[PDB]
Amino acid sequence: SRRVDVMDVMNRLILAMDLMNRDDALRVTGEVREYIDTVKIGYPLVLSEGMDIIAEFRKRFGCRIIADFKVADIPETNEKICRATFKAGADAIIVHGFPGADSVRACLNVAEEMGREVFLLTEMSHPGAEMFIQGAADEIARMGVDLGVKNYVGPSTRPERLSRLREIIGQDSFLISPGVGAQGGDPGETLRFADAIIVGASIYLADNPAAAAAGIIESIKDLLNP
Amino acid sequence: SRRVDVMDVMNRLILAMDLMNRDDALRVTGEVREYIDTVKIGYPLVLSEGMDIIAEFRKRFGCRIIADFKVADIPETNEKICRATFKAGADAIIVHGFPGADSVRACLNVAEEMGREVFLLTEMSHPGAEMFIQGAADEIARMGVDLGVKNYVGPSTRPERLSRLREIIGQDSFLISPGVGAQGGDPGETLRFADAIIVGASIYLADNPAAAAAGIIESIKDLL
Numbered sequence A: 001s002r003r004v005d006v007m008d009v010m011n012r013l014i015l016a017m018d019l020m021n022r023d024d025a026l027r028v029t030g031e032v033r034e035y036i037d038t039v040k041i042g043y044p045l046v047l048s049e050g051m052d053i054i055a056e057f058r059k060r061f062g063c064r065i066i067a068d069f070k071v072a073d074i075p076e077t078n079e080k081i082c083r084a085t086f087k088a089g090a091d092a093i094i095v096h097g098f099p100g101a102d103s104v105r106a107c108l109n110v111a112e113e114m115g116r117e118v119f120l121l122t123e124m125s126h127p128g129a130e131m132f133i134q135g136a137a138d139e140i141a142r143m144g145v146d147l148g149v150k151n152y153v154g155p156s157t158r159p160e161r162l163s164r165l166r167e168i169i170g171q172d173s174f175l176i177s178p179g180v181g182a183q184g185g186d187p188g189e190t191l192r193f194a195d196a197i198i199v200g201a202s203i204y205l206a207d208n209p210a211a212a213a214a215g216i217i218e219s220i221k222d223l224l225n226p
Numbered sequence B: 001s002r003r004v005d006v007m008d009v010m011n012r013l014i015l016a017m018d019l020m021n022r023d024d025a026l027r028v029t030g031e032v033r034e035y036i037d038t039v040k041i042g043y044p045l046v047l048s049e050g051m052d053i054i055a056e057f058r059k060r061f062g063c064r065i066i067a068d069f070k071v072a073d074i075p076e077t078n079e080k081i082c083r084a085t086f087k088a089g090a091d092a093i094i095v096h097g098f099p100g101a102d103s104v105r106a107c108l109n110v111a112e113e114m115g116r117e118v119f120l121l122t123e124m125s126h127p128g129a130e131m132f133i134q135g136a137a138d139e140i141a142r143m144g145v146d147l148g149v150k151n152y153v154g155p156s157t158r159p160e161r162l163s164r165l166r167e168i169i170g171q172d173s174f175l176i177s178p179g180v181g182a183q184g185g186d187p188g189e190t191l192r193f194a195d196a197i198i199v200g201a202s203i204y205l206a207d208n209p210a211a212a213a214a215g216i217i218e219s220i221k222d223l224l
């Protein structure tokens, strides 16, 4: 990405905090705070500890929050979900593109009004993505561009797909990518196209999360700056 | 549907309780309880009041709860979402099929392991559904059949699509359909294929929710 008006992710590493217990979640996040300042919080944690967990993370840690809720409902419900989520302190929210343009627009409008951001998930990192998602991936990405979407989520496990997504969305867009580590994606190859990588279990399940985070960062030192 | 062991939804009417305040949500639900015993609780309410709200609905009104979370993540995450959801008193959970068979199977395994139900959302009711979901709907339904899914969600706004979906899933499957009221779906044509209809705003935003529910039931009395 060439734009400077994007969230500045420390070390280009976003922690996918999917532990389902407040104690383990707060412990691991705290132990890696030195390397990460942007945390992706999803339903595994939220449905287990509640939305206030978002406020607490910003309190204890001075981190940005990406609510990975893969919003995928009708326009009316999507609007409500985004409103509740931003009200709770989320800086950005991840939204699915497959439900259509109106569903995505609903999220974009709320984000616009509240001054927050929407990240469009154009395709996924798991095996199942090949069944229905990849066939529509190109068009979903193009729909995002036409809608004026500037933030995207693409698969680390499929660098060949990530290259294509980047070409479609352009350099004036921001791209983050999950699937690194546990799913087999490589941090370095992924950062050839993505602006930041998302890492979950490789860090939060490690005997030493801090060392795991440090190791990943060391492995991409040549791609770290700016 | 022709199956005898299907979910028994009173008056074939499911309340989509999408109000975002526990007071209005609980009050309106109580107001229509004599007409509805099955409530669909989604993220608008859950993200606003917390997951404990599900048990509250059960304790207060003894209604069955369908957690409409449109689960649409990778298998591993879907697993966690379903587990947390069934631990909250949800009798069932709605999952997306677009992410593929592994994502759906993950939900099915948890439901089976925790003795609850999974509803597979095939085609959606809004206009945008025509862009990508509609073209994959029949295949998603067939995937559901092959996986052993017995509960489905289809659009009331497109009865002709609902008819095709019913053909694919068979009569031994349970089908619920949203889109009645606010979205212009016709209850009559919808119930020709769906076992139960989902109604939200046409009821919870009505000056008199009870009267609203009553009216809906009156318009489909011949199907009850």
Ligand SMILES: O=C1CC(=O)N([C@@H]2O[C@H](COP(=O)(O)O)[C@@H](O)[C@H]2O)C(=O)N1
Pocket: A016, A018, A042, A068, A121, A123, A124, A125, A126, A153, A154, A155, A178, A179, A180, A181, A182, A183, A198, A199, A200, A201, A202, B073, B074, B077
């Ligand atoms: O295509 C995608 C989207 C997504 O957000 N995710 C999420 O990214 C995280 C990956 O975590 P992990 O590093 O495999 O443990 C989880 O929170 C997933 O739900 C993914 O793995 N693939």
Ligand SMILES: O=C1CC(=O)N([C@@H]2O[C@H](COP(=O)(O)O)[C@@H](O)[C@H]2O)C(=O)N1
Pocket: A073, A074, A077, B016, B018, B042, B068, B121, B123, B124, B125, B126, B153, B154, B155, B178, B179, B180, B181, B182, B183, B198, B199, B200, B201, B202
């Ligand atoms: O295709 C679909 C799926 C679905 O769950 N829904 C949900 O069904 C409800 C419909 O509410 P309403 O009657 O339009 O106010 C909402 O909670 C929606 O999120 C839908 O409208 N269409």
